[PDB]
Design a protein around this ligand. Structure first.
Ligand SMILES: *[C@@H]1O[C@H](CO)[C@@H](O[C@@H]2O[C@H](CO)[C@@H](O)[C@H](O)[C@H]2NC(C)=O)[C@H](O)[C@H]1NC(C)=O
Ligand SMILES: *[C@@H]1O[C@H](CO)[C@@H](O)[C@H](O)[C@H]1NC(C)=O
Lengths: 1459, 102
């Protein structure tokens, strides 16, 4: 009879191996196989004419192969096939499932944790079923920590190392666990996954560690564990008093970002002299505290996290421990290479194998084996306890029970009988074996022996083939089969040894079985009744010898490097190969870098292509062939494979408050209560309960739980500070982790050296390099290589220093040599800095530590920098150079000088000489020069060009605070317009460079800016103002708007935008087509009565949402949203015209403008607005509208406005829609002299519209070939530069006016258009002059020292009582006066959110929030700790202005000391 | 610089025994000299399937090229010096196949 083996499944693009071997007689005979489609044996993908004969002992192989036929998505194609063979004597074939699982995807993220703004290096290795390069096109698809796509991209497979492009982390991303997936572009279901976590970097004030008694928790301590927590400052001095807060938790694993804490986790034992301690009866703290009341019932983890806020400074530091795996019994049995079907009469081989909690083998341990069995006679049997002990070299406790052939199923229990362990805590298992039933009474058992746990390649396998039992021995031939990686690769026949029973078979282990292997072995039994096949098989772990030996060696093999040393690196391979270097900061992994395995990590996964399963061998020759990962093609026996195919899987006083979690009915209410009480003593509990929005559902859970915690601080105890910790589950991490390197790929024909110097930096580099070629994939052994300098000083210079203040320049010199030593730091006296030398003050450093250093100074030269520092040691002398920023007091910049150069009197007159003079404000801060810039560019759209093509990295065009989402959108604007300009007006030819590439860079600059916002994108696709904030309908559009605009050149995600529209409409569009704003967000302050304003405020929103839905409309053209679009425009006509304000009108204008521009009514509206304009010089040279509306106070006091220019944009845009070309020429003459050097000065909302104009219009009109011939010059001083402008240079350099003269820009004749801006900056001493729009009070209290600054809005006439719109608070901090980082987070991070965004940047505390109501003040409070000793200090500056109208700047000096 | 991954079958003939392995070669060109073709075939057998180490040395390598062409190179002797000029087409070959006598 005949055998034809083949997998248990098929794959596409799979070199399916198919052997044929046969008991045919002398007559040699032909054999062609092939692969045909379900019921009609019509399609035949391939075949093979493999002729057998007595010379080939009747056997042969064939590489068939189902390529990509059926491609109709949706149709359930390909599911099932017919495999077909042919010959002279017969022909046969079969149906057997198949799939689209060809190869694998490896996503080598560079490092597996990132902090804001890093670039995630990443690539991908990809193999086919045959573990060869597998060239193809693939795509991944990053997926933010909540599970919503965020990007995508494909690429070309030239070698197999698919080289994707850096993914940059958001300036402010969503905190948690990212997911990178990967899929083949074309056909193939093959799944790549990988991961990476983003955590929020924080700055460490002092290092808090935390070491646990042991590393698990074995039954010895279960009522106790000794944890020691050790805090200490960086200047080699432990903390003394500090408050200690330690939580604990359960958890499941280390891949779970969430772990269900425990209550009654001990607060406070006061860190005491660089330590304290406790001991943690595990019993108690879990039973009632979660689903675990039982020791036993725990084999999962124990998570630890402390917080140690220092007592002296008021700082805070946090530190955590992932987990601490509990254990029952410190050993863990696991059967080994021991199949669970006992053939009969043979003795059964039971090889258990003990290990410890850390997964090494552990020998010399007792192993009692109680068993039980039942006759075929359905008679039971209780065996007798065998006991071995585990080998010393083996870890194996070998057993053997000889079994009464009539046995059946064999159940048995193993267990250690360690003599010292509680019985309780003795590791154990249980299993089951079963008789390969076979009616011919015929069985098989094959074995072999080797003393080593693996069978190196090259060795040889002696396997004994004992057919024991078969009523008879009439055996012709033994026949074997060896699969490996789901592929047969060996098979043959050994003629049976006539006389005697068994006999040896000897198969050379081949490299081709590298990772693992099984084999099986059948003899064809001719029972008188029927042809009976019979077999068995084994699983065969072997040595993970790679294909190409890739090794990397460091030229200097020293175990430490000089930071910057040039050092050669070596590659090597027995065969030509593709390497892939990757130098991580080994820090990442690190703290117990789990044993697991390095190259095995891959080898594990990588061989789940083992189709079969088990220790080996089945239950029927069928079953045996099944578990083999085969099914075979033979008429004689049932080559079946029951039903499906076996999903095989691994056989082979703050507690008194936390009770009231009893009011759970939603998470957020838990948040209503938790932070609820938090720690607020500056305002009652129903005062904080006012500011509460989200819902009255929680207000109860607030004031209930605050009162409870407030009566409490009157009883626990001038130091008192309640708490109840919970990092809100936020990923923070007190350590940076440098961008890696050596990420290049390489071609290495056995040898390749590439020298290079290592980066100056303190770290230990783990340069790991994977390489791949025609053998497959193989990891090289890593090669750590810490670089580091013995001793070295650092100097902590400040950001800035006011002239004349006395500063204390700190720092600390580092000793890391074993013994101590002598140093000598001296500061270089630079011109204008003051000091104490007219010097070598040698000191001593205890070994392996640090001696603080200090130098005092005081600068009189503002801006003066440079200070060279130097230390001396027996064997060294080093010079670290530093630089000091020197400032004055009261910065104001007044830039209103500006011209347009118009030689050709193209816009209203000829302009060939404007004059910016000297105007020293009588408030000048003496002896400080007036610094001023002079921006000369061609085109009305040249300022907006230079901005985006002279710096890199997208960027905001005002000094406005990054807080909102808005702001994160204001980044994508300046480029988008500039690309819409460059492109749509095709002007790419501005560039002397290669332009096409210049394009890309802008393209990028766009997409990446585009992601910059994702973070603010909510779940239901509604966007939001500040992260997580209640979705704002207003900004839900404003993004819609700039989203659909940038869709022009950067395809945006359809179904994203889709739902994105369908949110506003379906939910926030009143029964009159108007749009209700969800959140409390006030973007803009509208004038008018409390009634008026409402109607006004409604119009505005409904105006803005339209614009949005419009701009973007085209990517989700939709019935259901076209509808709403009209319901909307309708409200607009039917409600605008009794005009309330010019501003109001103008958006309602511009918005109809983006629709049916012909509704008579629109004409009336357009009229009204058009009516309202005003203007400069007759005939009109400048046209523009005012904030008001015909109340004509006419106060245009020589000064622009955020809202002014916003409005006129809105009309200039309407006009530029209606192509009113001559109405407009004066409107932009004045935009283009408003705009402030760089970008659109006043606020945001204007400067995007304002920019949309100035482009749209330079798009619509026609450009005026430039050819001026400028000359800037001092009125009296000789001439400064002068340069022929053209279309060659026009975004020319800026220039600061040095000397003291009146200036004069003054082109000759020429042509085109030059926007001369000149932004002059000066420091003044008084605000007494200026306009207060905000009432304030700021003063420094002592109840150590803390700032309480206040404000109330000053309502302008006509304005509503409600007070301010979206507004910021800006506090400058006196030179060196850090503020209470934790203080602010308190204010914002809650449902009593008084503010909504804080951020300490370069010396300033910057708070955002929605309003500054005028009923009373609104006051912030935070505390501060002089980070050093500052001389006579020049006060800082508390300023407060309204985000949308920068016009409201009430600025005020103050000083943080009464001295 | 074509890089085809061909598959050749190995079969050792220990008399009424045959241990047969299926496996691959790597042709790194579009056309190769039967010399290089031959130096590569034995090179591997020599480094992988036990050739020239013991009773191994006598056999016949059978290159497949088309639906009717079958040729060999005696492993009993490298005396093939005139045909070593012969040149072969890369994407032509269909399936290599060896048979061993010890
Ligand atoms: C500290 O600063 C001084 C002045 O800035 C540095 O002086 C220079 O040394 C380099 C190296 O020879 C010269 O090329 C420069 O011309 C020097 N600058 C001037 C204008 O004096 C000095 O190098 C720094 N200290 C050290 C030793 O690094
Ligand atoms: C707080 O008040 C309780 C009840 O009146 C009193 O008994 C207790 O002494 C106070 N707390 C402490 C420890 O002083």
């Amino acid at each position: 009879t005949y055998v034809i083996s083949a997998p248990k499944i098929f794959r596409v693009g799979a070199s399916e191996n198919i052997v044929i071997q046969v008991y045919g007689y002398t007559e040699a005979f032909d054999a062609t196989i092939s692969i045909k489609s379900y019921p009609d044996k019509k399609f035949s993908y391939s075949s093979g004419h493999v002729h057998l004969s007595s010379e080939n002992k009747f056997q042969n192989s064939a590489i068939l192969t189902i390529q990509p036929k059926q491609l109709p998505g949706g149709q359930n194609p390909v599911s099932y096939v017919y495999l077909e063979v042919v010959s002279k004597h017969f022909s046969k074939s079969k149906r057997m499932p198949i799939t689209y699982d060809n190869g694998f995807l490896f996503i080598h993220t560079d490092k597996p944790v990132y902090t804001p703004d890093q670039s995630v290096k990443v690539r991908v290795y990809s193999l086919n079923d045959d573990l060869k390069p597998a060239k193809r096109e693939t795509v991944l698809t990053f997926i933010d920590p909540e599970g919503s796509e965020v990007d995508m991209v494909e690429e070309i497979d030239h070698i197999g190392i698919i080289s994707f492009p850096d993914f940059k982390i958001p300036s402010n991303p969503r905190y948690g666990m990212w997911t990178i997936k990967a899929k083949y572009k074309e056909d193939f279901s093959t799944t790549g996954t990988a991961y990476f976590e983003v955590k929020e970097y924080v700055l460490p004030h002092f290092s808090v560690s935390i070491e646990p008694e042991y590393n698990f928790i074995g039954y010895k301590n279960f009522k106790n564990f000794e944890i020691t927590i050790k805090a200490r400052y960086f200047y080699n001095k432990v903390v003394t008093e500090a408050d200690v807060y330690i939580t604990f938790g359960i958890r499941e694993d280390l891949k779970d970002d969430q772990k269900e804490m425990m209550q009654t986790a001990m607060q406070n034992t006061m860190l005491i002299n660089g330590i304290a301690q406790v001991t943690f009866d595990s019993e108690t703290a879990v039973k009632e505290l979660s689903y675990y009341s039982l020791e036993d019932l725990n084999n999962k983890y124990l998570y630890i996290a402390v917080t140690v806020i220092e007592s002296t400074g008021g700082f805070s530091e946090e530190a955590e421990i992932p987990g601490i795996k509990y254990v029952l019994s410190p050993y863990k049995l696991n059967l080994v290479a021991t199949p669970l079907f006992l053939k009969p009469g043979i003795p059964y081989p039971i090889k258990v194998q003990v290990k410890d909690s850390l997964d090494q083998l552990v020998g010399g341990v007792p192993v009692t084996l109680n068993a039980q069995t039942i006759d075929v006679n359905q008679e039971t049997s209780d065996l007798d306890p065998s006991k071995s002990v585990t080998r010393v070299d083996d870890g194996v406790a070998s057993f053997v029970l000889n079994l009464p052939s009539g046995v059946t199923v064999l159940e048995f229990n193993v267990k250690t009988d360690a003599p010292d362990l509680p019985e309780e805590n003795q590791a154990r298992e249980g299993y089951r074996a079963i008789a390969y039933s076979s009616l011919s009474q015929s069985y098989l058992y094959i074995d072999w022996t080797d003393n080593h746990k693996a069978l190196l390649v090259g060795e040889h396998l002696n396997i004994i083939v004992t057919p024991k039992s078969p009523y008879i021995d009439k055996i012709t031939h033994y026949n074997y089969l060896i699969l490996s990686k789901g592929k047969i690769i060996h098979f043959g026949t050994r003629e049976k040894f006539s006389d005697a029973s068994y006999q040896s078979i000897n198969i050379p282990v081949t490299q081709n079985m590298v990772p693992s292997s099984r084999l099986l072995v059948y003899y064809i039994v001719t029972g008188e009744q029927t042809a009976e096949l019979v077999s068995d098989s084994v699983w065969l772990n072997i040595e993970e010898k790679c294909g190409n030996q890739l090794q990397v060696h460091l030229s200097p093999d020293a175990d430490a490097y000089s930071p910057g040393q040039t050092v050669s690196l070596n590659m090597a391979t027995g065969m030509d190969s593709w390497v892939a270097l990757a130098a991580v900061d080994s820090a990442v992994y690190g703290v117990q870098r789990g044993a697991k395995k390095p190259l095995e990590r891959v080898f594990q996964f990588l061989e789940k292509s083992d189709l079969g399963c088990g220790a080996g061998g089945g239950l029927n020759n069928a079953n045996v062939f099944h578990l083999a990962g085969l099914t075979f093609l033979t008429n004689a026996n049932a080559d079946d494979s029951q039903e499906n195919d076996e999903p095989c899987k691994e056989i082979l006083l703050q507690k008194k408050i936390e009770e009231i979690a009893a009011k759970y009915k939603h998470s957020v209410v838990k948040k209503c209560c938790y932070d609820g009480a938090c720690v607020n003593n500056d305002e009652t509990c129903e005062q904080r309960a006012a500011r509460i929005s989200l819902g009255p559902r929680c207000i109860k859970a607030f004031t209930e739980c605050c009162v409870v915690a407030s009566q409490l601080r009157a009883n626990i105890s001038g130091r008192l500070h309640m708490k109840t910790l919970l990092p809100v589950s936020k990923p923070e991490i007190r350590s940076y982790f440098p961008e890696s390197w050596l990420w290049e790929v390489h071609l290495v024909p056995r040898r390749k050296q590439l020298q290079f110097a290592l980066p100056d930096s303190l770290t230990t580099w783990e340069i790991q390099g994977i390489g791949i070629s025609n053998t497959g994939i193989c990891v090289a052994d890593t090669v750590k290589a810490k670089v580091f300098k013995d001793v070295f000083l650092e100097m902590n210079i400040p950001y800035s220093v006011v002239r004349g203040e006395q500063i204390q320049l700190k720092g600390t010199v580092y000793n890391y040599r074993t013994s101590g030593m002598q140093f000598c730091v001296k500061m270089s006296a630079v011109e204008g800095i003051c000091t104490s030398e007219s010097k070598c003050v040698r000191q001593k450093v205890e070994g392996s530590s640090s001696h603080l250093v200090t130098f005092t100074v005081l600068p009189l030269e503002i801006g003066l920098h440079n200070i060279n520092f130097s230390l001396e040691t027996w064997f060294g002398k080093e010079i670290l150079v530093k630089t000091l920023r020197v400032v004055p007091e009261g910065v104001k910049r007044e830039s209103y000088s500006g011209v347009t150069l118009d030689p050709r009197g193209i816009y209203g007159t000829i302009s060939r000489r404007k004059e910016f003079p000297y105007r020293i404000p009588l408030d000048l801060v003496p002896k400080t020069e007036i610094k001023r810039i002079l921006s000369v560019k061609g085109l009305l759209v040249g300022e907006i060009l230079s901005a985006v093509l002279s710096q890199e990295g997208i960027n905001i065009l005002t000094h406005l605070p990054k807080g909102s989402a808005e702001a994160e959108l204001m980044s994508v604007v300046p480029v988008f317009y500039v690309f819409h300009y460059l492109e749509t007006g095709n002007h790419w030819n501005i560039f002397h460079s290669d332009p096409l590439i210049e394009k890309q860079k802008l393209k990028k600059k766009l997409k990446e800016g585009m992601l910059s916002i994702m973070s603010y994108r909510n779940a239901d696709y509604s966007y939001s103002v500040w992260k997580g904030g209640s979705a704002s309908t207003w900004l839900t559009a404003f993004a819609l708007r700039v989203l659909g605009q940038v869709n022009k050149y950067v395809e945006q995600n359809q179904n994203s935008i889709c739902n994105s529209l369908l949110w506003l409409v379906e939910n926030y569009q009143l029964d009159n087509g108007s749009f209700k704003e969800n959140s409390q967000y006030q973007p803009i302050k509208l004038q008018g009565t409390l009634p008026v304003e409402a109607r006004e405020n409604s119009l505005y929103l409904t105006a803005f949402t339209v614009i949005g839905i419009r701009k973007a409309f085209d990517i989700c053209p939709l019935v259901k949203i076209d509808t709403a679009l009209i319901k909307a425009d309708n409200f607009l006509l039917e409600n605008t015209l009794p005009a309330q304000s010019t501003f109001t009108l103008a958006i309602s204008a511009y918005a109809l403008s983006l629709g049916d521009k012909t509704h008579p009514q629109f004409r009336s509206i357009v009229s009204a607005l058009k009516r309202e304009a005003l203007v400069k010089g007759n005939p009109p040279i400048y046209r523009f509208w005012k904030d008001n509306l015909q109340h004509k106070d006419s106060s245009v006091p020589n000064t622009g406005t955020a809202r002014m220019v916003e409005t006129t944009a809105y009309a200039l845009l309407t006009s530029l829609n209606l192509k009113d070309i001559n109405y407009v020429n004066p409107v932009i003459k004045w935009l283009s002299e408003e705009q402030r050097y760089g970008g659109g000065f006043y606020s945001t909302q204007d400067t995007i519209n304002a920019i949309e104009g100035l482009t749209e219009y330079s798009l619509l009109v026609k450009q005026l070939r430039l050819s001026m011939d400028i000359d800037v010059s001092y009125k009296h001083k000789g001439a400064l530069h002068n340069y022929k402008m053209t279309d060659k240079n026009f975004l020319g350099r800026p220039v600061e006016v040095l000397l003291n003269d009146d200036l004069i820009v003054s082109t000759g004749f020429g042509s085109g258009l030059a926007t001369v801006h000149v932004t002059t900056v000066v420091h003044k001493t008084s605000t007494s002059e200026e306009v207060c729009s905000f009432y304030l009070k700021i003063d420094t209290q002592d109840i150590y020292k803390r700032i309480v600054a206040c404000a109330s809005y000053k309502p302008s006439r006509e304005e509503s009582s409600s007070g301010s719109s979206h507004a910021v608070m800006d506090i400058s901090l006196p030179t060196g006066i850090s503020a209470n980082e934790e203080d602010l987070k308190a204010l914002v991070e809650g449902v009593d959110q008084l503010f909504t965004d804080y951020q300490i940047k370069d010396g300033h505390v910057i708070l955002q929030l929605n309003s500054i109501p005028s009923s009373d003040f609104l006051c912030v409070r935070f505390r501060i700790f002089e980070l050093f000793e500052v001389g006579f200090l020049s006060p800082a500056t508390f300023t407060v202005y309204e985000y949308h109208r920068p016009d409201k700047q009430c600025t005020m000096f103050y000083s943080t000391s009464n001295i | 610089s074509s890089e085809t991954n061909t598959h050749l079958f190995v079969n050792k003939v220990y008399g009424g025994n045959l241990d047969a392995s299926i496996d691959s070669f790597s042709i790194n060109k579009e056309e190769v000299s039967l010399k290089e073709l031959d130096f590569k075939i034995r090179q591997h057998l020599v480094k992988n399937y036990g050739l020239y180490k013991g009773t191994t040395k006598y056999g016949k390598i059978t290159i497949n090229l088309k639906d009717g062409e079958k040729q060999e190179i005696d492993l009993g002797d490298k005396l093939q010096f005139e045909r070593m000029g012969d040149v072969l087409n890369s994407k032509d070959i269909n399936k290599i196949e060896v048979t061993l006598k010890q």
